[PDB]
């Protein structure tokens, strides 16, 4: 498990937690290219069940 | 058919009568079933139930 460490340490039950946005500001985006997928599925209103719509 | 004996038979002569009797259908028994377009992505309920019903 220590093998997928991703932080030098751990929280301690006193460490102060600083917020980042401190101002209204539009945001730039920046990611690479394997993060967000669009999953995506079929409704099957094609089917005999749905007879009477086209 | 009745019967009667002998020679004379002045105003003996029988009618004719036929009864019948009444048939009759009942009921439809029905089998209702009602699903959303999500679960007709397998289709193995549905045959299924299909089958059971007959």
Redesign the interface.
């Known amino acids: 498990q220590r093998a997928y460490a991703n932080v030098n340490t751990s929280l301690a039950d006193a460490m102060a937690v600083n917020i980042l946005n401190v101002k209204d500001a539009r945001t730039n985006v920046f990611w690479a290219d394997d993060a967000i997928r669009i999953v995506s599925?079929?409704?099957?209103?094609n089917?005999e069940?749905?007879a009477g719509m086209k | 058919s009745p019967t009667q004996e002998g020679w004379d038979l002045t105003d003996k002569a029988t009618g004719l009568l036929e009864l019948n009797v009444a048939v009759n259908m009942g009921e439809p028994d029905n089998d209702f079933f009602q699903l959303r377009a999500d679960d007709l992505r397998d289709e193995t309920a549905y045959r299924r139930r299909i089958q059971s019903a007959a």
Not at chain 1, 41 to 45: R, S, T
């Open positions: 599925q079929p409704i099957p209103a089917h069940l749905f």
